[PDB]
Every structure is written in structure tokens, then in C-alpha cells.
Amino acid sequence: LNGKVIITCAVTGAIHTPSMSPYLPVSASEITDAAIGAAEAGAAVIHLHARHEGDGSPDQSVEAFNPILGVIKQASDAVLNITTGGAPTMSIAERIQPAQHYRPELASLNMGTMNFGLFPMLNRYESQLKHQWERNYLGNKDIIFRNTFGDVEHVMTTLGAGGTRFEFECYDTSHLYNLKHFYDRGLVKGPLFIQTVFGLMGGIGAHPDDVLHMKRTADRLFGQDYRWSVLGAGRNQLNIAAMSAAMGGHVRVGLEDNLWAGKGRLAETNAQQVRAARQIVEGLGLEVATPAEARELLALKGGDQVNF
Amino acid sequence: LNGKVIITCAVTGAIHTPSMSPYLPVSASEITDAAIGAAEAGAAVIHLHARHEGDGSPDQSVEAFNPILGVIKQASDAVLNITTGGAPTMSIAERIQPAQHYRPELASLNMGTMNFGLFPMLNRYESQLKHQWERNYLGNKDIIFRNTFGDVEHVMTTLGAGGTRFEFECYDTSHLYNLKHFYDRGLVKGPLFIQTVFGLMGGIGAHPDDVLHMKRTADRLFGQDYRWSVLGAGRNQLNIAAMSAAMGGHVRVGLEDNLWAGKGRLAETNAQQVRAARQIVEGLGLEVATPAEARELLALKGGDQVNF
Amino acid sequence: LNGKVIITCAVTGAIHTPSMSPYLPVSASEITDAAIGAAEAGAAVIHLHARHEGDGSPDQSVEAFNPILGVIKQASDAVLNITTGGAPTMSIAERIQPAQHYRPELASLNMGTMNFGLFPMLNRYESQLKHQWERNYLGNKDIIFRNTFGDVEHVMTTLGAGGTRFEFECYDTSHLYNLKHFYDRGLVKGPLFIQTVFGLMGGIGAHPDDVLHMKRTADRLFGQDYRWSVLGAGRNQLNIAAMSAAMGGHVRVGLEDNLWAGKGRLAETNAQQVRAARQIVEGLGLEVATPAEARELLALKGGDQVNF
Amino acid sequence: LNGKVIITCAVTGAIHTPSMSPYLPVSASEITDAAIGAAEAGAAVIHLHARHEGDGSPDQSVEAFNPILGVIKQASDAVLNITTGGAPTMSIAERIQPAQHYRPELASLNMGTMNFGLFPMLNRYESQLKHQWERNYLGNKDIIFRNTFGDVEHVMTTLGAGGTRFEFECYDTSHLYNLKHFYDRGLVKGPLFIQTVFGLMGGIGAHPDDVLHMKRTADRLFGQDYRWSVLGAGRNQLNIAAMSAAMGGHVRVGLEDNLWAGKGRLAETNAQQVRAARQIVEGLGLEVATPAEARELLALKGGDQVNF
Ligand code: PRO
Ligand code: PRO
Ligand code: PRO
Ligand code: PRO
Ligand SMILES: [Zn+2]
Ligand SMILES: [Zn+2]
Ligand SMILES: [Zn+2]
Ligand SMILES: [Zn+2]
């Protein structure tokens, strides 16, 4: 398995909004088409959210994933990874209900409580926002992603009992330290899939020294018992992916994380970012991991051992 | 002013509790005695909280500082720095009322929302906790220090209008990035007093690479328009102070931040930690800054230009 | 010039020897064909050495470049960069005679005296060595590349007078500090073309922390007044090229530096390595620099201002 | 041994010259008095050179150490460490003759060939130079310290057979990689005493990032099997000593390395610099190591197992 790079594709998320790009997937069929195309392009892991079809706003309910998960699984053996994020006012118990019911191989896990903002972008996007929910959100200077020590323990115990393992999303150094606290307690066992997230407002930035700091910290705290992946937000996406691939890590792309392709051009598909990351991986002389290889690298339970 | 090291002394805080050490100052007279002794030992800046005298629990009200601030100022020309922290349930408007009324030269400003915990220490301290509030607090796995982008802007505008400048407490890289957002908007002007805080559960750790990462980040984002200070929590206090002093930075000590002296011995006074930091500073061939020197280095309004 | 990446191709050098790979160019026509193929693949700068045609040993004489330089210039607008290296017993005056006579736009300049060794490969390669000079060289534990402060000054003054600018080869941190000494004296003017060389025995290694250390050091010492390129020796070539490209730097490839392609195979051409670098550059959404773009970025005198 | 800091004192060396400071020890009795005073102040290891008494020039002959070693041993239990440096034209066999004959517990070992220079100080110091040898040396732009792979191997095998262990002087990253080559071959066994040297012209600089780079590199290459000491040349001496002590490392001081005390004054004794380091060590709450503690930490043969 040496020299195999796992590409995760995060297809729509909850941070970007439909007025920001006509290519952001909104309907269940757009999301499944995006996931299937990304998997066919080489993404072994698909990170999934759902949205309301009427206005594109985030929908974290159990049933919102019903027309998503089985459709993708029928078409692709990719590893499906269900978010545990949600609105700042939603309880951790409600946020984990989709992963608790579907028992996926992976669920995402944000490792700390943090501010988040997109309000600096209001000058560029306000005139094109079509829905009031987007105006309310983009203008909100009081957003927190809440993931207390007690919340994270609850997710680890409750979802871990169903065989789900985590994409541990770590947005700054303290998230790696928080993860070390739970790893030393035995609440999660290795190999840990650690997704270090760069460039978001409220998180660490995307400078090369930020990337190496996160890598050095994770190496020191976890040794060989983790698998490193990077998420470079926005136009950092491919620069940070190339650093990770060149350093022995794995790569996350997707329209959840970056709407752009080049100088002012929007990305039209998730598959197009997978293809770019694959060009970098293969240019290095490495190979993209298949879903079966990713399941071995991440010690996952199998695409059949799920409730969909 | 080159080669002058500002020692800040944080005398009691709100993180440690009285059952943890009989030397933690609780009454207003204990706090003023601690501040005056620390200033006489060489601390040019005193970071202040108040407590209820009956049970030692934190007291963030305006009047709790009345028997503190004028008493210290009568005895010492040190710069008095009032906290803006408070219970996780207290609004930012209520948290800033003491600094808003007293118009101090400095107030503290936490730069992001973060988890915090002391619950891992429950096994060592539970049997000695005398007050139920300490049991409730030490056992709480859901503590957040809330400092949203909107909260921080409110503090900057409201307290800045009274001439107060900030001790910007930055507990991880993202806090430096958050501060850069407000600095670029002009909401705070340099020189920025940046207190990088190491070793707390919920914050960055205290490894030497953490220290250098925070320093490099601040240098890149702020250039020469800041003054660096370090706070090493707990038994990291003097190791991190010595790194900063040897690198051109300033130093924070105090029982708010570290209860210990050596191998299992509690520190008996704040002045004793000031004396240790002063031994390191002078051993380097440097000198401890006086309050007048600190006011020049930090561009402060003067110890007379305050409402006490 | 935003987003334009200069690819240097070093076609043969003096460190590898013919018995290590049948694809290492030896004759003048193999060296010119290699250079022209590399430039056609996208290399804007060609770093050149010559060899004796009979046994492949290094030939640093003026006339050894006569059947090389004008031939490449007639076929390609690439920038031609002449080595100033030489056998350890050759004086700096003799080493510089080729660049002194030909007055190229670029010449290489090693910034410090250092050990170098290949002897650990002797066990594997001894049986296949066809020439005694290769046995004497690979077995030599006493190799030094001599470049004293006086030597480097002589190169800077003597070749600078002919309008030649330098590829400053820096094989460790001290080489960047040596360069800073001469830059502060005004003996070289920016923009400095700094080639940081990783992975040779006797130089810095090729770990990612070594790459970021050389970048951070150069950024601190030279600011905006340099252009960074990387040389990852051996199988580090593409990993380190990808880091550089992803960080705003330029890339050096070539059979002088790395005999290998992917997965343990030898590289058949220099062009194949240029193509691999170009796949990484274009995968990042960047563009390979043309010779005219490299001349502007490096402030070079022009391909029509040379003595060939 | 937790918390015990080894102070090495290098009393005279060969880099500074008498006309730079009247306090640099020259005669055998000035060198022994300096060593005994430094050991009494707290230095557990004394790094020794000899000089010609008539003009102060370096004297690397066996017999130049005869009025030095036994005199110090009779007065102090400090570990005596004999240089293996020498004029650039002296063979490695001649350079090692003193340690070869005397079979000390420690000998110094420079791990690579490098430039060295003092010529930038010539303008300021020329008028005060009293001896022609000092003028010839300070003006020399062609100084190399020669330590090839073959040279270092010869030192390791020849002096190792007498039970001498090494102070491995590493003046840049490549020296730690050179040491790793010999350690992996088994030519030296741990624990390795690694002295990372900062700030010399021709070596790595003395910026805090240089210090952390050498520490991180040594930690990665050698793990727990080394003991780290720092040498900050010149006025960097105490800043870098403080970083090391605060990070779990050891400290080297002495007039060989730094002629200065504080605030631009020359240091009158080696003991004065030991006292300053000890003030930093004790201010940190650490303790200076005794000779017996240094022998255990460095796995030395004992002061009664030497040939003097
Ligand atoms: O999308 C997710 O899964 C995470 C939750 C916080 C922000 N994004
Ligand atoms: O004590 C203060 O001022 C800060 C507030 C959060 C934790 N400590
Ligand atoms: O090939 C060159 O130009 C350099 C000289 C020293 C080693 N390689
Ligand atoms: O003094 C010594 O032992 C080393 C040898 C090279 C420079 N200094
Ligand atoms: Zn997500
Ligand atoms: Zn406080
Ligand atoms: Zn070359
Ligand atoms: Zn020496």
C-alpha cells in the first residue's frame, strides 16, 4: 500500500451556498451524480451532506440521506462518509442521528469548538444572493461550530459502537491535542484518519508553515498510528494537496471545500477536482488508492457492513 | 528600550480554584497584596480578576474591582490590566462592564471561541475540593470560552473608545489569524500586545515547536507592529518564559497561570514567580522593564488616565 | 508572470557516471540532443557540463563546450547555464574558464566548501563499473568540493564583469548565510536565483522539514529579492519539485541530479523528467515558464548577448 | 538525572586571538587557572586547546597539553575534553596525536569540511593586532576546516580504541546527517554527545529557527540516543544556552566561543560565563550537573581511566 494516495471528495457540504455557484450540488440526484462521478474519477472516499431541494439550505435529518446513500452504493464501491456537522443550534445527539441510523464506515468528526465566518465575502456575493437564508448566514458574525469535550466523547462512544470510524477534522493545532486526549484514553483506536483543514476563517491558515506545523504535530502525537489527509480550503486546495502527496499524505478535494478551478473560473464538477489531484499524484509517480485499498489503509469495516 | 523585558503578573484568574492551593489569592486584600508584591519584584503589568470572598468563586462584576484597583494604584505605578473573561453563560456586554467603567490602560481580549477543560485533573484534586462550585466546574466537559467575531469586534470598538488597549490572548494559530482580520480592518492599531498562551487543555500545547510556530506566525502576520509575550501554563511557565526572553519577547507569570514552583512544591506568592523570571532575564544579560518603559513599548495612555 | 514556474534541466553533470545508467548523456551530441529535447518539453534553463567522449569522465575545459553551446542555441531559445564546478584539485581560476570565455547568461556557483560522497553505493555498483576512473571516484572517502570565501568572491567579480548571473547552489543553511554575506557587500545584485539542493551525501537531507528550513531561511535573509528553485537529488526529485511549485517556487530536474524515473526504473531521457515536472505544475493550475519569462524573472542579459 | 544540565566550558580555543581580548588565556597556567575556575563555577566538562606561550598562536602538539591536563585533574574532577582541530594544512593523523596519546574521556570531533572566516572584523581590529600571525589569519579568505568522511572515520576508529568518546561538533544540518551515516554503520555508539554550533561565519546562523531546526533534525535522526548541547558563538551565547536549557538540552560557554559578557563588555573570565549560564539554569528550576552526572549522561569511562 505504500505510494497509494487516498482522494476524498467532499461533494457539497454546508459552508458554500447555491448562489455562490450554479455547480454546487443541491438535489439528491445532483449529489449522487456528483459522488458517482467523483468516485469514477478516482475518489475512494465520498464525504456527504444533504440539502433541502427547495432552497438549497442544509438538511441534516436522517431521511435527507435516504435518496443519497443507497443510490451511490448501488453504483459505486466507494467508502461513504456521513457528516456529523449541523447548525450551531442543533444538539450533538441530533447531529449524529444520520450516522447513528445508517452506520456508515466513516463519519466526520470536528475536534473542537471554533468560530467560523464568511462575512468578509459579503461585498463580492451580496448582490447575487437569491435566498434570505443565505443573506442571514453570510452576514452572521456570531457563528460557532460547537464540539465540546463532552460532545466529542459522545460521538466517539455512540457512533463507534456501530463500527463507524472517523474522519477527524482538525482545524488547528489544538484539535490535534484534543484528539490526543481521547486517543490516550482509548476512546478511539488507530489508525486515525486525521484530516487537517487549512484556510478557513476561524481555523489555521494555509501558509506552508501551517501545513508543516500540523504535520509535525500529528507525527509527534500519533507516530505511525495515523493516516494524514489535507483539506486546503478555496484556492489553496491543489497547492496543499500537492504538499501532502509529496510528503506521504492523502488528499481531500470537492466543491464542499473549493468552488474554484483557476483564475476566476468556477469548477463545474467534483470529478474535475479529483482529476486535477490525480494528475498531481500520478505526476509524482504515485497511484490513487482504490476503495479496497483505502479500506485497508483506514481499517474500515466494509461497504456491505452498513445500514443502506 | 531594546533589551528590556516586560513581566506581566496574572495574580489569581478564574481557572484555578482555592482548593487547589492555599496560596491562590481570594479576598480583595489578598489580591492587592499579591499585585503590589509582584510589582515590587519587577512586574510592570498586573493582570487582574476578582473573586467572591465567601467561596472564592469568580466575580466579574464592576464593583468587585472597587476594593482592588485604586488600592493597587495608590501603592504602585504598575499598569493595571482588567480581564474581559467570564462565565461561559455571561454575555460579552456584561463581561466588559468592569473595563468599560474603569477605563484601564489594558484589558485582556481572548481572540477566539474555544473548548477548555480541567476534568483530567479530577483524580488528583477531587478529594480535596471544599466547595460544590469547584466540583461542578472541574467535572464539566462542556466548557466553552465564547469569543465570536462579533463579540471581539464589540470589545474592540467599545473598550477602544475609552483609550484602553488590549492584551490579545491567542491560544492557537487561528487566534493570530483572527487578530489579523481585525488589524487589517483597522479596528485595532499597533503596536499589538500579543500574549501567546501555551499548554491549556483546549489550546495549543507547550512543545518548543508550538512556541516557534506561534512566534513565526505572528512575525509573518504583524511584522514589527507587535510586542510578543508568552504565557506558559502550569509547569511550562519558566521554560516558555526563557524561550521568549532569549528570542526578544516578553514574559507572563502568575498564580492565575501556574500554581507550582518546583517538583511538587506550590508557589507561595506571585512575587516568587516574578523573581524567577527576573533571574532568567538578568542571567541573559537583559533588564526587566519598568512600568514607564512598558507604557512606551505598548503605547499605553498612562496610569493617571483611568477611572480609579 | 504570476503562476509561471521555471523548469531547469541539468542534463549530465559530473556526479553520476556512465556505468550507473546507459541513458546518462556522454558525447557532445548526446548532451545537445538531451538539452534540446528537455527545452522542447518545457525546460527554460539548461544546466550544462561536458564529458570526455572516450571514457565519459568529466571535462571542464573551455573547448569541451564548443560543440555544445552554439548547437543548442541554434535549435532552442533556452537559457544556457554553464557549470563552474570541477575536480577537487582544479583551481577556481581554471574552473571558471569556460564561463569566462563564453560569457553565458547564467553560470552555476556552489556557495560553500563541503564533503561529498558516493562510496556507500560501491558495494552494489562495483561489479558493473567499466572504467577505473569510476572505481577511483566512487571509492573516494576524501572528496571535497572547495569553494572558499575568496573563491566565491573571485567567481562573482570575474564572471559578473561579463554580464553572467548565477544559479547560486546552496546545499545547506550555511550556504544561504554565505550568500547573504556577499549580497550585503553588493558583490551580487538581486534578484538572486537560489537553487537549494537536497539529499546529497555531504549536504542537507531531503526531508520536508529540510525543504521548509531552506525556504524560511532564504525568505528571511533575502525577502522578495530572490527566486527560489529546488533540486531534490535522486528519487526525491519530484516530491521536492511538487513542494516548491505548490509554494511559489521553481523546479530543477535532469539526469545530472537523478538517474531515476518512477517505481525503480531508470529514466531514459531528461525530457521525461521535464514532462513529469510539467504534469505536476499543470495539475496545480500553474504554467511552465518560457525562456523569455525566465529571463525576465531572473533578470538575465538575453540569449543574443553571449559569446557563442 | 532529570533536570540536570551539563555546562561545558571551552576555555581558549584557536579561533579568537590574544589581541582581541587581554582575558583570552594563553599560557599553560592561564589555561589551567581558567579551567579550574570554570569547573568550580559549575562546568562539568572542560574543552581544551593549547597555545604557544610566546605569541599566543595555536599549539596542537602532544606536549603542549602536558602542563595542562594533569594539573587540572589534580585540582578538579571535571571531564577533560581534548580538541582534534588543527591548522588547515595539518593532517588528521597529526591533529589527533594529543587525544591519541592522552586517551581522554572526551575529544572534540568536527563533523564536516567547511569554510570559516573572520575577515569582516579586519577593518575594526587591524590596528590593534600585535602579531603578524593574527594579521595573516584574520585576513585569510581561504580558510577551510577539513574533516572528510575518511578523516572522521579515522578519528572514530583510532580514538575510539582508547575509550575516548566524542563531542560531535555539528555546525549545520549536513553535519548531523554525516553523523547519522557513521552511527548507522556502528562506528560510534550512543548516547551521542551532539554539540550544535550556531553563528560562525561558514556555519549555520544563530536565529531561533536555526536552533529549532538543528534540534528537530537531531531528534528525528537519533531519537533518544543522544544528548543535545548548544554552542552559541559570540553574543548569541546566553540566548542560545537559555533556549537549550528550557528545551531539555545542555549548554556550552567559554572564551573560546564568545569573548563577551553583557552590554558590550568583554568577559574577564570563563567562570563569569559559567555563572551566567548557571543563573539561567537555576532560574528555570533546573540544576547544574556535576562531573559524575555528566559522566553517566554521556556514558564516559571515568577520570581515573585516562593517560594523565
Ligand atoms: O462540513 C462538516 O462536516 C464540517 C462541520 C463544521 C464545518 N464543516
Ligand atoms: O483569564 C482570562 O482573562 C482568560 C479568559 C478565558 C480563559 N482565561
Ligand atoms: O555540478 C555542479 O555544478 C556542482 C558542483 C559541485 C557538485 N555539483
Ligand atoms: O575548536 C575546535 O575544536 C573546532 C575545530 C574547528 C573550529 N573549532
Ligand atoms: Zn463536511
Ligand atoms: Zn485572566
Ligand atoms: Zn552541475
Ligand atoms: Zn575547540
Residue numbers in the entry:
A (entry chain A), B (entry chain A), C (entry chain B), D (entry chain B): 3 to 310
Copy the relevant paper text.
Next, a β-keto acid cleavage enzyme (BKACE)28,29 converts the non-native substrate MSA with acetyl-CoA into acetoacetate and formyl-CoA. The Claisen-like condensation reaction accepts various β-keto acids that react with acetyl-CoA to form an acyl-CoA ester and acetoacetate. In these assays, BKACE15 from Paracoccus denitrificans performed best. BKACE15 forms a homotetramer where each active site is accommodated in a TIM-barrel fold, and consists of eight β-sheets that are surrounded by eight α-helices.
The two openings of the TIM barrel are closed off by smaller α-helices. As previously reported for the BKACE from Candidatus Cloacamonas acidaminovorans, a close homolog of BKACE15, each active site coordinates a single Zn2+ ion. We confirmed a 1:1 zinc binding ratio in BKACE15 using Inductively Coupled Plasma Optical Emission Spectroscopy (ICP-OES). The physiological role of this enzyme is unknown. However, the genetic context suggests that BKACE15 is involved in the degradation of aromatic compounds, while experimentally confirmed substrates include β-ketohexanoate, 3,5-dioxohexanoate, 5-hydroxy-β-ketohexanoate and β-ketopentanoate.
